[PDB]
Design a protein around this ligand. Structure first.
Ligand SMILES: C[C@@H](Nc1nc(C(=O)O)nc2nc(-c3ccc4sccc4c3)n(Cc3ccc(Cl)cc3)c12)C1CC1
Length: 89
């Protein structure tokens, strides 16, 4: 989670929409802003808080799915990797 990364133009436009201001991040900080995007947009369900629904949301489009579990860390990593580039420092 200390690997430095640059999100692609669309994810950047997603994180900067919830208060982000860097162009270079770590996985930690990216997950935090995705968290706030999820708060901000009420994507987190109250009936069961294991599923984020994003089918009508730009996140669904970046992620390629209508919904995912917040416990499916391996699939979230994957979906997010496909949306960034790694940098030196
Ligand atoms: C560490 C993993 N993050 C998490 N893990 C576990 C767990 O393992 O229990 N529960 C989690 N609950 C949340 C969460 C998310 C949004 C909201 S909004 C109100 C409460 C709340 C709680 N997150 C954060 C999260 C952030 C971004 C994304 Cl995209 C997906 C999940 C959890 C990470 C994927 C690798």
């Amino acid at each position: 989670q200390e690997t430095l990364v640059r999100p692609k133009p669309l994810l950047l436009k997603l994180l900067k929409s919830v208060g982000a201001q860097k162009d270079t991040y770590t996985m930690k900080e990216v997950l935090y802003y995705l968290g706030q995007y999820i708060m901000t947009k009420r994507l987190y369900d109250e009936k069961q808080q294991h599923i984020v629904h994003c089918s009508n949301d730009l996140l669904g489009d970046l992620f390629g799915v209508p919904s995912f579990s917040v416990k499916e860390h391996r699939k979230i990593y994957t979906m997010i990797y496909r949306n960034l580039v790694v940098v030196n420092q």
